[model samples]
Target: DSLRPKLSEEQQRIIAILLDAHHKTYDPTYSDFCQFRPPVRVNDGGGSVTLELSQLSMLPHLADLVSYSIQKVIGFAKMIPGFRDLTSEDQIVLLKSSAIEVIMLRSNESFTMDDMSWTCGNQDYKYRVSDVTKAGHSLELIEPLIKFQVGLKKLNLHEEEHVLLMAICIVSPDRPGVQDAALIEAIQDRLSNTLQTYIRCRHPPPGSHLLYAKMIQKLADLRSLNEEHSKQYRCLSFQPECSMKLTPLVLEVFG
Candidate 1:
């Protein structure tokens, strides 16, 4: 079925060998692969991201980076229903639209690496924010630098600072690009405005917390789309010892 493709050649060969061995050893008619269903069923499943979280590691700034990023993405995704089930690329675009919100919440004085590094359930493992960034550099600069360095530049929305670049990037006319970008931006802008107003006027409904919860879940769902990779390695097959462990720098800490 187009919903799922046929198993790969190696898988097919493995199945044949298994079936033949089973027939020779026990029964001829028994089928092993016939009823197989992929446990990893999400379209574009499996991952390339790896996180390093041993007893010793750098990038403590990632703690706040992850916490705030996840919260903002979740909140913004929850605000837009279409983004909840859309393709990965679309989910990213939606998150970019709300990048400002993340800066707002995570950039606060109280938002620290301490809150980001350790799970809300665990206190001892957390590190203080100052430990990650010294007095020389502020968290504002650290936020974009860390995100971009980690290949997560999409979450940046300091476009207002880049006047000429922003104008040129938004002015595509070929391939019906301008209209598509315009319509999508318009709809997302409305979603943004509605969300901002809801927050500004304190007009969230009684069950708004429910919406917040639902959004955090969606943020997890969408982050699954981008699989980070090893920067040092060329071919993934070359590293048997290197495991696919992407350190989620952004995770939801529900209070």
Candidate 2:
């Protein structure tokens, strides 16, 4: 008999719904700002192509996308068994702790490995990762963020793995002041076991086990990324010309 582990029928259904919701918010490009492309004008004489701030100004759109992605993750988590049973305060705490990490994971798709810049939407404008790091802001954390993205690309997680990992992060036990620590910890443990078993069964022993450890470490690395992200957002509030403001929920949770 094959020792392959499997998700329960309910788990599969929930995962499907979560994935669908995530894609609706995160994929197919939602707003014009996200899908906005640079304009090209034809000239009888040879002309130059220049991209301007007016054309490339997408920070506001990016903020909206991040905020919506966080909301979608929370919505998906609510669909999980026992998730809604948590105290409302605990729910808020968990969402606050993990929202940015979930966003980071989803946003990895926007990053281009070749040039180290993130493309806002399908073919839209890109911003260099190095520019931010070069400014001495969150420089230490950027490498881990890069490594996390590269590791995820290499791991090539399945949809089920992706959904389960999000669940694991959402139910984190260490979120300060969670009302029901025991229950939340139980939820996280179950997810951890499920992920471990699924990986082991699919990939076989030794190597798969190591991959599982690495994946867990990625979660820890994500905390660093989330901290840096929050720091940058807070700094943005002080900028004189800053027009893009993070959603209130993000500021409340992550601030």
lDDT of 2 by residue, 146-175 (tens): 778888767767666777777787888887
**Best-matching candidate per TM-score:** 2
- Summarize candidate 1's per-residue lDDT along 82-153 as a digit string, tens digits: 333344555454454334334333232223333343222223323333333321123444454344323222
Give Cα-based local distance difference scores for all models: 0.31, 0.65
Best by lDDT: 2
lDDT of candidate 1? Answer: 0.31
Backbone clash count, each prediction separately: 8, 0
Per-residue lDDT, model 2, residue 20, is: 74
The clash tally of candidate 2 reads 0
